[PDB]
Amino acid sequence: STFKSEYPFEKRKAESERIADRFPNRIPVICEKAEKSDIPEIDKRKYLVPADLTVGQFVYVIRKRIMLPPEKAIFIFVNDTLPPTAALMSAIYQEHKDKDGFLYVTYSGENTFG
């Protein structure tokens, strides 16, 4: 079950507001495995991301977390888009942040846009 499904809106927004107060330079991100993929599962889904990171830098960390070998594919989706790894996480946040203040991303071993 998804982070969004487990916690009511007021709790999720309360959390992202607390992160805004305590860690103004960190992006609050929810990172979950996509449905129709056999990619490995992830042990943790809530991340505080330094605001300067690129998507590619973020992906490097996620790949390590799920112990993906370097030859295997991964794709990070946001809002039914596939952002380039050159993009800034700060820019992705500004465009795609949820009403609750988190940025929601999903990862997959398959590129649904192919």
């Binding site: 809530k46 505080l48 991301v49 990171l53 973020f58 960390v61 390590k64």
Partner: peptide, 22 residues
């Protein structure tokens, strides 16, 4: 889902540091 919300992160955040990129 029942009571006033609280900002407590009982499910803790994972903090990514820049050194995790080295």
């Amino acid at each position: 889902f029942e009571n006033v919300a609280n900002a407590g992160s009982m499910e803790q955040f994972e903090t990514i540091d820049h050194k995790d990129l080295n």
